[PDB]
Design a binder for this molecule. Structure first.
Ligand SMILES: [Zn+2]
Ligand SMILES: [Zn+2]
Lengths: 217, 214, 56, 98, 56, 287, 49, 116
DNA sequence: ATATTGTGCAAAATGACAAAG
RNA sequence: CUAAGAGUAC
DNA sequence: CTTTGTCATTTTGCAGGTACTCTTATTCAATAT
């Protein structure tokens, strides 16, 4: 980490969240597809509150009746610094306006994400039948193809407390503790530029990556 | 706007690394420009709306007295930053004709995401002018500040001749450094040029090696 | 082993030898120690082959 | 091992006849929906049918083998969790006495 | 001698008691997984550590 | 004190080392490596003791990794150049309705996970809805390539009767049994893919067999006697074609069997493996 | 207490060569393996004839 | 998901959009058998699966001599004796929680604490 | 009667193939 | 003599 | 329209060092000179 914030444990947690790769698959408990004839009222009672907020805050006439519902995990949202707003924004950004997305609030008992595919104004006499399949395909890619936070090829990050030798201002060498990050998977080029870390002191087992990033020496 | 903040921070870091690169290459860059703080960069090279502007970010550098004495064959240098995410052939053509008409023997082009391959083919212009392309994402961190990276010093032709004379070496008998190595790209090495490497050795305090660009 | 119930994670079930060589080993401990020694011998053979090739 | 022996193999026809006599439902007229909790009986890797009361069948097979009616080399396993009953009479199986 | 053997037996018994306590916590699901590993991996790590330090 | 159990070949005591092999007629499911497109493979090394004693390996493979969407199950039939989808095989054996095939494969209505994993297969084989059509589809893939268009059905039938799961039966009228066995294999593969069971251990000693002197001499003598009877048939055909007289003594060449057995026992190589027969160790009684 | 069988004798898990070792349970297992391999090279009386 | 089959040709039924009533409708793909959908759910995907942990429980599971016994309370009989085993879901990340079957009433109860 | 002839890495190389100008 | 195989020592 | 990078195949060459003993086997059989 940055020398001024070496002992700052919460800063280390911030960096760990920043670099560790996270995907919906690690967060979603389950995924479902429902038939909701209108994108104004839901046939599921549990998530009624969600719509009666979002639609109240807010177009909807060109939305497919098929709905994709993702149930997330509270523990997943806890051990990783993720919130419903962040994941909703990521899905919205990666899928543009082609998918209308709403999500429950974090304090709610259940974490629910509801998505609907916007229908193009052109009439389709056969795409309606395969819409479910199309939604399934979309759901599939949404599970793994998009990244919430972190950089690719970083499967897992763990935090360790090492103890280095630092020359004390009075003159001796003292056992200064430090928070260090170990990482499974190597993405040296993307990790090295992450703010808050010490770019000089980053090291890797894979000397191939070191050679191709830092140089032959 | 967090995306805008991170983008401008990365651009500032890239600017600092580019200034450091130009200064290391032997040109006259003052240390104050190198250590320009983020707020000053935002005030100067960013508009009122918050979007940084690259056209006025481009600049020119000239060799210092020591470099001129050691390398009496290299004149001014131009650094340009592109605006659009993907650089088109027309923009590269404008850059290269600008380099040629201004009699810059070297021009560093710093791009955003990628170069169209049809623009790559015309990157080698009429000599002695040379064009070098750098990606901003690769310039955010100055690799030469890594403790693993030792000190690289380009040698003059006279120095190379003296080295080969004293060690009785041929061109091929020196250790090689690829002409795509990140440090070689950083220093603008060309084939046949020898870099002296100064290293912290654990048997003797200092060890000097040499690598010829291939 | 078929001498233990299912899902027994106790130290004696999964190969803890609490007896010394002076006291002697129970049959289960004897078998588990035999498995450990077999792993050692197999590792010896594989290691000598691989290290010979690497050294050459 | 000192007490280990290798089976020489026996004809499985008598055991198949025993199974058919003792209630093994033939595989041809087996419909899984009407018999969900049915134990699948295998002889030498050949699924011969299903049984609805495997406990009694195993008890009588054990009794027959213990009195010598079935060749002692025949091995009979009942996996309760997987609801399976495997019988092996082929040669090459290594066994020990207990 | 006898007192040392008795103390060794007491140490082994205390280690087995600690292993049993960790097993009870894991079975009650009250054990929390060490970050970077699964619940079973953390339990195995704890048990192996206890037995190794007991032998030591 | 001599215990026997060895042969005397040319005055040398020869002992047959028990050869270990994997047992036959046992379904084994294995997870495959990440790079391969198939994730799980359920295979049986079918063999029949009272027949030709030939090894036909049937494999049922689940294409697509865990993250993939098109998870289709395909079977590798003998003398076929492609991995036929399982539903096509099921319809070929005679099970047309999708519900009946799924019943043959999955035995629980509530196990909707297996049904979800199994839907791609029936979606794949939706284009065939007839037993004759499926038989034609298989025959078209037939590697023999010497069957006319109308007889492909019969060819496929023959392959399904005498090459598919030989250990069950070689006769006809047992298509239901073979379909049930195929459903059982698919069920095992899906159980392994659904993380409901671990992949079968290859080292489990109950899955192994030891061929002793009996079976080794059995298969050796089977080959050698087949050679001798082929020689008998060739001699008879030659003498009847040339109208020469027939004599049993000139027909049978006992040297065939005698020399074959003596060569196999005198030198370790067991044929026409190595070290199957070894010089008996007589340094010490325990040795 | 739900046993279905009992071992006739645990010492019967050993083979012919390992059955000669005295107190094999008081030895390191590789030593038992070495003795099992090395007793076949022992010199005795292989047969009375 | 509770899939259902056609009652005419015993073939799979698939979901279909309706225009006159704007309702989900299950239809056959070969004989055109049509009926109403009991539930709007048409697809379920379990990333974290809870079923299958207690699979293989049978009325004679107590007859297994390999299964270990216990005297823990049965919260339907208050009996001591029962059999117990760990989760049958062979995923490498499953918890070590134990499940118990009373040999008298055949009630399956867990040793979990957060659930209780 | 006898001589003569009917295996598992794992790197490298290569080919097929959806996207890009 | 040659070749192949098996067992074995460190 | 041709690249262009990219995966999925195909090759394809290797696989510790010494040392000891013994055993078998050197194309089978039919035809023609
Ligand atoms: Zn129908
Ligand atoms: Zn009860």
């Amino acid at each position: 980490l940055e020398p001024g914030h070496a002992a700052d444990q919460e800063q280390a947690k911030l960096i760990r969240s920043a670099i560790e790769h996270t995907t919906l698959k690690s967060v979603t408990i389950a995924s479902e597809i429902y038939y909701d004839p209108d994108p104004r009222s839901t046939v599921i009672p549990e998530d009624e509150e969600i719509i009666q907020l979002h639609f109240s805050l807010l177009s909807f006439d060109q939305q497919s009746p098929w709905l994709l519902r993702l149930e997330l995990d509270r523990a997943a949202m806890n051990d990783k610094d993720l919130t419903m707003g962040q994941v909703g924004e990521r899905i919205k950004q990666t899928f543009k306006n082609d998918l209308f997305v709403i999500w429950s609030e974090d304090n709610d008992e259940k974490l629910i994400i509801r998505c609907r595919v916007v229908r193009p104004k052109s009439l389709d006499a056969e795409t309606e039948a395969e819409e479910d399949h199309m939604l399934k395909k979309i759901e599939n890619t949404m599970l793994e193809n998009i990244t919430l936070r972190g950089v690719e090829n970083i499967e897992r990050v763990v935090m360790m407390k090492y103890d280095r030798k630092v020359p004390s201002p009075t003159g001796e060498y003292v056992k200064e503790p430090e928070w260090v990050l170990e990482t499974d998977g190597v993405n040296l080029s993307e990790v090295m530029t992450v703010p808050g870390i010490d770019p000089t002191r980053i090291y890797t087992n894979s000397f191939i990556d070191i050679m191709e990033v830092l140089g032959i020496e | 706007d967090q995306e805008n903040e991170r983008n401008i921070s990365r651009l500032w870091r890239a600017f600092r690394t580019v200034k450091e690169m130009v200064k290391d290459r032997g040109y006259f860059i003052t240390q104050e420009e190198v250590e320009l703080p983020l707020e000053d960069f935002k005030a100067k090279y960013c508009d009122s709306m918050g979007r940084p502007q690259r056209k006025m970010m481009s600049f020119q550098a000239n060799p210092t007295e020591e470099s001129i004495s050691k390398f009496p064959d290299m004149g001014s240098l131009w650094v340009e930053f592109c605006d659009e995410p993907s650089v088109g052939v027309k923009t590269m053509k404008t850059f290269v004709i600008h380099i040629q008409e201004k009699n810059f023997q070297t021009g560093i082009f710093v791009y955003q995401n990628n170069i169209t391959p049809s623009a790559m083919k015309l990157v080698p212009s009429i000599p002695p002018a040379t064009i070098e392309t750098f990606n901003e994402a690769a310039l955010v961190v100055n690799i030469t500040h890594h403790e693993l990276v030792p000190k690289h010093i380009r040698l003059s032709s006279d120095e190379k001749r003296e080295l080969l004379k004293r060690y009785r070496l041929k061109e091929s008998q020196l250790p090689r450094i690829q002409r795509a190595d990140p440090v070689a790209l950083y220093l603008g090495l060309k084939r046949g040029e020898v870099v002296k490497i100064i290293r912290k050795s654990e048997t003797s305090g200092r060890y000097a090696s040499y690598r010829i660009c291939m | 082993l078929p001498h233990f119930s299912k899902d027994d994670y106790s130290p004696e079930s999964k190969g803890f030898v609490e007896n010394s060589y002076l006291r002697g080993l129970t049959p289960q401990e004897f078998f588990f120690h035999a498995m450990g020694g077999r792993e050692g011998l197999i590792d010896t053979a594989v290691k000598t082959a691989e290290t010979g090739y690497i050294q050459r | 091992s000192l007490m280990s022996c290798i089976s020489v193999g026996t004809d499985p026809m008598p055991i198949i006849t025993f199974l058919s006599e003792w209630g093994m439902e033939p595989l041809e007229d087996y419909v899984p929906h009407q018999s969900p909790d049915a134990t699948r009986v295998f002889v030498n890797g050949v699924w011969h049918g299903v049984h609805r009361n495997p406990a009694r069948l195993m008890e009588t097979l054990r009794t027959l083998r213990r009195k010598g009616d079935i060749n002692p080399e025949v091995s009979m396993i009942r996996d309760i969790r997987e609801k399976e009953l495997k019988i092996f009479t082929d040669a090459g199986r290594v066994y020990r006495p207990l | 001698d006898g007192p040392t053997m008795r103390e060794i037996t007491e140490t082994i018994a205390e280690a087995k008691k600690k292993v049993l306590d960790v097993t009870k916590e894991a079975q009650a699901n009250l054990l929390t997984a060490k970050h970077g590993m699964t619940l079973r991996e953390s339990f195995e790590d704890n048990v192996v550590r206890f037995l190794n330090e007991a032998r030591d | 004190f001599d215990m026997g159990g060895y042969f005397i070949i040319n005055g040398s005591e020869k002992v047959l080392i028990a050869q270990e092999r994997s047992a036959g007629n046992i379904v084994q499911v294995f997870k495959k490596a990440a790079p391969s497109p198939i994730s799980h493979v359920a295979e049986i090394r079918s063999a029949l003791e009272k027949g030709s004693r030939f090894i036909s390996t049937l494999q049922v493979k689940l294409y697509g990794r865990e993250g993939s969407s098109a998870r289709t199950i395909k079977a590798t039939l003998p003398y076929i150049k492609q991995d036929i989808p399982i539903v096509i095989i099921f319809r070929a054996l005679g099970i047309i309705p999708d519900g009946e095939i799924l019943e043959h494969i999955c035995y629980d209505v509530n196990d909707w996970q297996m049904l979800e994993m199994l839907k791609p297969c029936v979606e794949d084989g939706f284009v065939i809805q007839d037993r004759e059509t499926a038989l034609d589809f298989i025959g078209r893939r037939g590697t023999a390539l010497g069957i006319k268009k109308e007889k492909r059905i019969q060819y496929a039938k023959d392959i399904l009767q005498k090459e598919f799961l030989p250990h069950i039966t070689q006769l006809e009228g047992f298509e239901s049994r073979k379909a049930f066995f195929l459903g059982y294999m698919i069920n095992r593969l899906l159980l392994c893919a659904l993380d409901r069971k671990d992949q079968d251990d290859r080292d489990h000693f109950g899955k192994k067999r030891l061929d002793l002197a009996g079976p080794l001499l059995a298969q050796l003598f089977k080959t050698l006697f087949k050679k001798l009877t082929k020689d008998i048939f060739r001699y008879m055909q030659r003498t009847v074609e040339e109208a020469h007289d027939f004599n049993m003594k000139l027909a049978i060449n006992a040297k065939t069997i005698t020399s074959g057995l003596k060569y196999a026992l005198a030198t370790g190589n067991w044929g026409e493996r190595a070290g199957v027969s070894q010089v008996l160790n007589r340094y010490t009684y325990s040795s | 207490t739900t046993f279905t069988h009992c071992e006739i004798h645990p010492s019967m898990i050993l083979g012919v060569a390992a059955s000669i070792i005295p107190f094999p349970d008081h030895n390191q297992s590789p030593r038992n393996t070495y003795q099992s391999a090395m007793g076949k090279q022992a010199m005795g009386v292989f047969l009375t004839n | 998901t509770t899939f259902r089959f056609c009652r005419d040709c015993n073939n799979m039924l698939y979901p279909r959009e309706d225009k006159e009533n704007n309702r989900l409708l299950f239809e056959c793909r070969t004989c055109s058998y049509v009926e109403e959908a009991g539930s709007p759910l048409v697809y379920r995907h379990e990333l974290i699966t809870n079923i299958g942990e207690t699979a293989g429980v049978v009325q004679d599971i107590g007859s297994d001599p390999t299964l270990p016994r216990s005297d823990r309370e049965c919260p339907k009989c208050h009996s001591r004796e029962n059999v117990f085993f760990q989760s049958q879901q062979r995923r490498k990340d499953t918890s070590m929680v134990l499940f118990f079957v009373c040999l008298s009433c055949s009630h399956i109860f867990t040793s979990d604490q957060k659930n209780k």
